[PDB]
Amino acid sequence: HMFQCNVPLGMESGRIANEQISASSTYSDGRWTPQQSRLHGDDNGWTPNLDSNKEYLQVDLRFLTMLTAIATQGAISRETQNGYYVKSYKLEVSTNGEDWMVYRHGKNHKVFQANNDATEVVLNKLHAPLLTRFVRIRPQTWHSGIALRLELFGCRVTS
């Protein structure tokens, strides 16, 4: 069997509905909500209430899914023109929403390297596909502040 599971799961397309996207918190003025985290979104991005490595953006994929890659951007503020981006993050996954497991980048590094500017897309293809229903992106380092736009790649599984 050839798993052709490099297809977007629906952040940019909207196949992942607004209700499936959530976060630990969001910036207090309401201009950086979790629903602004879609790749190539044109209005800011997701930013938490505090810039902290305890914050996360969370997506419920609704079904058991083989996840194969993650792409991210930062965002340029529509209000100030300041750029913000996540430089590295930890990937956490769950099947029931409550027990979370880190997926390491690889043997030698736990975190994934992410963006180096506010708008270029950076893709990380997972070294091994994984099975999950829920995805959490936990920023670890950032430039100016946490802002995130996201795409997830993979495919539903059966049998």
Q: What are phi and psi of 4, to 5 degrees?
A: -100, 70
CA–chain centroid gap for 96, Å, is 18
How far is residue 5's CA from residue 82's CA, in Å, rounded to a whole number?
35
- Number of alpha carbons in the 13 Å side-chain half-sphere of residue 19: 1
CA–chain centroid gap for 108, Å, is 22
How far is residue 139's CA from residue 57's CA, in Å, rounded to a whole number?
9
Beta strands 112-113 and 83-94 are: antiparallel
Q: What are phi and psi of 110, to 5 degrees?
A: -75, -45
Q: Which domain holds residue 148?
A: 1-159
| Total count of domains within the chain | 1
- Return all residues near 45 (Cβ < 8 A) that are at least 6 apart: 32, 36, 37, 73, 74, 75, 84, 147, 148, 149
155, two tokens: 């495919």
